[PDB]
Symmetry: C2
Subunit: 427 residues, 2 copies
């Protein structure tokens, strides 16, 4: 059934394609959604996510909407069937559907860290990494976990993560050291490894526009630029300047800067406007710990985004529950932050929440089916409240017998099925 070649690519019979034209995504009510089971715990958590999503859509839409799941292959199932880890057909499949849910992939051989994931983002130009962090009532190390409700928009193509670097003892490094010294009078130690940190106007703008669009569509009232612009003036400082610039250029009537509030509006953010402000990166880390209620949408370059999203997830006791999505222009692939968890693969022990919440982000936010997100979040909060959870959560709760992955899936489905919509979908 799943395709190995371009010629074999055909979406399943009664699904219709999500389309993207004129800056606008068009989602039919019977949308094709690609899925990739991936590796390790991926197949298990992907299976759980499909079942929970199907139940959610039946529940809130009662037949007026249905997802048409389209299986594509990457990782070990692709090696088995197709003889390669990432068939071109899989890439073209995602491009055709525009939307995909995927499990984690193992890193091949001696290739880059998560090289398959990188190959996917690169082929599809998925420049924005989006990570929501919310609290579900779980045991958490943060006293203020219930005030953490954030999304990190992380530029995912540039920064030190771009891979531009050379070994200390390499002839490349020696050539750079000499170039730097003769041309610019810059001295770098002979025994120094060397990395390059590029940050561009183009990539910053694209990311900030997408962040601002999320804020407008979600009714967020603050977008915070996280940067180390005091020390790194021409990369991170520039990121900050360019991010402000595009906000004022393209969303002028929707935004006000902190600067403008504190000299034009008397400390009060006017009604109907998004506050766009900025925080020095190390201070930003302190601030989500100390005053998390002050932050909603966070916009960051690659590394900063990586750090702040991870810190936020830990605060809410959400490390293994964190969802994410990599988004381009009118195309998105959602997946959990966690890896393949090899020691849990196939044991029906893993928490499928991350994968479920990844589907919920894809369908609820990117595709616009908000009520699916509402009911899914409701179901997860209910399970947590009722102590009907997998071991990673249950071990922190006295007297509680942990659920198997499959049991927790059926528990979420029961809660979804039994939900009083008048209460769940209000406001």
């Amino acid at each position: 059934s799943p395709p190995c070649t371009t010629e074999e690519l055909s979406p399943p019979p009664g699904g219709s394609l999500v389309e993207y034209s004129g800056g606008s995504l068009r989602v039919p009510d019977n949308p094709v959604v690609a899925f990739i089971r991936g590796d390790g715990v991926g197949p298990e958590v992907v299976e759980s996510a499909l079942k929970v999503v199907d139940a959610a859509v039946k529940k809130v839409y009662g037949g007026s909407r249905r997802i048409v799941w389209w299986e594509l292959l990457a990782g070990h199932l692709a090696r088995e069937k197709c003889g390669e880890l990432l068939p071109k057909a899989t890439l073209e499949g995602i491009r055709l559907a525009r939307v995909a849910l995927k499990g984690p992939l193992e890193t091949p051989v001696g290739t880059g860290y998560r090289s398959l994931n990188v190959a996917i983002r690169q082929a599809l130009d998925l420049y924005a990494n989006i990570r929501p962090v919310r609290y579900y009532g779980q045991p958490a190390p943060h006293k203020y976990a219930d005030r953490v409700d954030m999304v990190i928009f992380r530029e995912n193509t540039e920064d030190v993560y771009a891979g531009i670097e050379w070994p200390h003892d390499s002839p490349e490094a020696a050539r750079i050291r000499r170039f730097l010294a003769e041309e610019f009078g810059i001295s770098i130690r002979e025994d120094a490894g060397i990395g390059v940190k590029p940050i561009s106007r183009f990539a910053t703008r694209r990311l900030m526009e997408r962040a601002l669009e999320w804020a407008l569509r979600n009714g967020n009232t603050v977008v915070t630029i996280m940067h180390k612009g005091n020390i790194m003036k021409y990369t991170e400082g520039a990121f900050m300047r360019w991010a402000y610039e595009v906000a004022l250029e393209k969303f002028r009537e929707h935004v006000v800067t902190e600067q403008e509030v504190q000299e034009k509006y008397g400390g009060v953010r006017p009604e109907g406007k998004i506050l766009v402000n900025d925080r020095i990166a190390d201070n930003m880390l302190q601030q989500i710990i100390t005053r998390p209620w002050d932050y909603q949408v966070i916009v960051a370059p690659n590394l900063n985004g990586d750090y702040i999203s991870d810190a936020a997830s830990a605060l809410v006791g959400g490390i293994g529950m964190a969802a994410g999505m990599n988004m381009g222009d009118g195309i998105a692939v959602a997946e959990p932050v966690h890896g393949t968890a090899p020691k849990y693969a196939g044991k029906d022990l893993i928490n499928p929440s991350a994968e479920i919440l990844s589907a919920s982000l894809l369908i609820g936010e990117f595709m616009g089916w908000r009520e699916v997100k509402s009911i899914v979040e409701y179901a997860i909060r209910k399970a947590v409240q009722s102590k009907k959870v997998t071991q990673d959560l249950a071990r922190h709760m006295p007297g509680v017998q942990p659920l198997r992955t499959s049991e927790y899936t059926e528990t979420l489905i029961a809660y979804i099925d039994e939900a009083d919509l008048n209460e769940v979908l209000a406001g």
Copy 2:
């Protein structure tokens, strides 16, 4: 109070600290320099000198005493001297070996990011040391009482070295075309560009100082914080070089996680330091989730900056964070906080950060380890009985803030009254 070099002279009652063959030797009447600096500066340092002297008077009985030597930097330097940072002041530090300073204002147009950069560079203070501990304050972290860490941060290299060029600069254009022709590397025309250098020499130095501190303090874990999975040849090399020097110079004192698993049944032998490593974003997660698993953290410049800041926030200790910049036989301690201009002169400021800087200097670098036990004891006591300044009082319903001077007095009493048989 000096303005120039050929007028440097330690106060007559005291003796100089000396460094000789990797060994600090400290007399019982030492000279320690102190710079009052700017804003709340003069206040917190004044409070600090008075607390530490009470601490030394009590803990040793009067067999020991500090001889404080006033040097100037910032507003008091530009006033008396004509300049923001006398060559004298710097040379006085090099002579005395040990210094305590308040925070400083950097005017724009100086060439340096901060006046502190200038002091570190002149004196080769390559290691930034930040202890993070909990004193019973209101704190956002449920596990704050199990945060007891020291961050050894490499303070000379990394993206913080200032090597970068504007996107539209001729320099950036030249680098872009060099990288393209020579290595087939493409960077966008509209990209700003920074260089991240990490060297074997700087890493080794830092790691050695960290391991020495661990041994001196009976720490049982030293954790290398790196992003070596993505930045193989900078942060990964930092990690490899740190391990390499631990095993080369501290073999008989250290053990790795693999060694503990394979040779010792998964249990660290009591007299050995566990040397391990964590991916940097995971490390952030781990100090939040399992702070008890971490003590000494060894990081390159940026990583150290981020993790120390996160840890201070967890303990509700942002304004209480102490720090020290250390070279080979030289140290200058100072608060992490700035000048705080609006509290300057107003007797409102929490002097704890400066006291802790002193006690880090005198008790951890000068080695009078009983001075730190009683200072830290004193601060915990003050917080526990809710005798604190408004920064802390404002998170304690119904508590009335003490003034700076009042808090200083309170701390003195707790030191003079302490039971040494329970504290030491």
